[PDB]
Nucleic acid binder design. Structure first.
Ligand SMILES: [Zn+2]
Ligand SMILES: [Zn+2]
Ligand SMILES: [Zn+2]
Ligand SMILES: [Zn+2]
Lengths: 198, 193, 198, 196
DNA sequence: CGGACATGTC
DNA sequence: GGACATGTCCG
DNA sequence: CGGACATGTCCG
DNA sequence: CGGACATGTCCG
């Protein structure tokens, strides 16, 4: 079993926070975020845009790390990883190791860490300021198993934790959101939002 | 020595409530109001509800502790039997020797009392969620009452105490527990009698 | 071709199969449909298959079972357990974890991966009926659902049962479709309901 | 890896004998010839007879060892359950983890094997008394077959071997054991199921 | 085992 | 959005 | 002693 | 599940 990372929102000295697109709940949607639940619903291997918003600009060398943990405390000390089938299915993007649930796409400077000591997986990219005319920096994440994958997540909900860190891995900022990876994100978002009514 | 089992509703009008789940031979947890007794299966979810007339201050804590019901056994610490103490069933948070765990709460804290040696488990008190009239804690009991070398078919009470952040008494309630393979079946053998 | 033959034939001992008549209660553990020649059964539950002969074959006769895919486009693919169930802790101490079909309650059981085809099979000595019985019952178990991703993945299989002499020469064969599923009764009823026109 | 359980009467014609016993509900110890199985209560005397055609040499010893009968459990060392191992019920000679004890014999030795981790108990072989045909050892079994964390409802075999003073095998036999609260009841049940 | 429903595919 | 295929939970 | 009962387990 | 049972404990 592994110690548990903090999931506490920390805006830090750069005013670090997250943003998400507004996508709707049509059954045709590949990734959609629920503000009410602070929860992303997405399809396996489809683009999940996460926006990085800051008040001041973090210094060059700053990195952005994403890590999954189980949301339920009775599972939180268990490492999150891909199921046996998907680990073997060779849908490699050329850089992500097969065991990793979360990938980043479109970024040559991506790095994957399979930690020596907690054994937890994470994916990290250098922080980049927003492009010209933009208020935020967007990272494209992929989740490589469904929440239901037997022998992996096994229908257990996860949280993704996003940390802004310095070149030595010291904490600068943190935010998190729950994720469900599922076949029909629009439908499932609607169901969980309806259950919130309750 | 023996921890108090005396009902004390206190200034917050603290009371316990239980799900009314009926008596199927193997329902996972059921409660008998006639006996004030919870019948539950080993390691399964055992909801216990905290009902208050007014909200205790934040920092308030909710502790649970098992004692033997019968006078001749009351001074003996309630613990898991030698077999279950050694099984591979740690949730990563709870001591393997503790009978009572709480599931679903990352702020769970476990105590072996340095003086009495008794085991207990504590969580922060939180008020009920919107739409709810009570706070539910999910307890697990990790041995059957019948376990040889543990409870050995001796009945226990669970004592639930409401405490301030320093451990001062704010409220107390309790209930008898039978942990068994067939809670529905057994509830009756005490409720058909 | 190289696909093993599935062609039913009784041969000189008048070899054929019988099944229990278990009905269609929703979650019955194993049931057989004569209209479909199809067994419906739950993962890892006892599946009684009866061997009936008109005359007793010789000492050293053996009885082999093998799965193949029923659809022509999948027939050349070896039927194996999915990676999840392969790696799960459900061993009986005898079966290879990769094998779909086990025999329970028989210490003389032997498992084969084919030299040339790599197809899996399970074989036991033929024994004549017990005193007072007219058939020999073998207890099979199927160790993945038809639905298992990374395994059968929703493709139908047939089970081929062969009676063989001690050198492996064929003496008789019978095949039947198998659906391994959570609700054998439900699914049998549904499939037979779907035979008729409105 | 399992010690052999193969019956080996050897050059001394080594056999075992058991009282012709009854099937009263809680008789302390009872052998089933039909099952080659002893049914006995925890900690009660279990007499076992040694029968030989030719007497073994001086320094011969008699060893008893339990193994699980069922093939998928055979690799596992038979030991007492965590509760009984900690019960303090030693007779002064048997280490507490050992399932099988010998009563009434101060020359008993208990072995914890450093290579195999199997437990066994061994006594010197003594020829039958005058006008006696056989030698009786009194064994005790210190967990029920049911004990969770120990045998856990798994049937066991007891293997009795004759060995020379250096531990070389002279003969071997075996029998099934159920340790249980009601040996006669269970004998009957198991013998009824024999018909099925 | 199996009503209710979770969750995937056509 | 849709109907269904086909699984798990907990009594 | 056997019967009743307490109480865990499993097939189908 | 639904009983049938497995298996220890208590009483007559
Ligand atoms: Zn997966
Ligand atoms: Zn226990
Ligand atoms: Zn599978
Ligand atoms: Zn024991």
């Amino acid at each position: 079993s592994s110690s548990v990372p903090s999931q506490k929102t920390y805006q830090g000295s750069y005013g670090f926070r997250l943003g998400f697109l507004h996508s709707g709940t049509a059954k045709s949607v590949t990734c959609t975020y629920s503000p009410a639940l602070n929860k992303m619903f997405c399809q396996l291997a489809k683009t999940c845009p996460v926006q990085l918003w800051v008040d001041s600009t973090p210094p060059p060398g700053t990195r952005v790390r994403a890590m999954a943990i189980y949301k339920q405390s009775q599972h939180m000390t268990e490492v999150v990883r891909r199921c046996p089938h998907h680990e073997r299915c060779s849908d490699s993007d050329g850089l992500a190791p097969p065991q990793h649930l979360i990938r980043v796409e479109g970024n040559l400077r991506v790095e994957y860490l399979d930690d020596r000591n907690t054994f937890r997986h994470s994916v990290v990219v250098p922080y980049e300021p927003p492009e010209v005319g933009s208020d935020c920096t967007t990272i494209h994440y992929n989740y490589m198993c469904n929440s239901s994958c037997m022998g992996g997540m096994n229908r257990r909900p996860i949280l993704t934790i996003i940390t802004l860190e310095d070149s030595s891995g010291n904490l600068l900022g943190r935010n998190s959101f729950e994720v469900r990876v599922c076949a029909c994100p629009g439908r499932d978002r609607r169901t969980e939002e309806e259950n919130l009514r309750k």
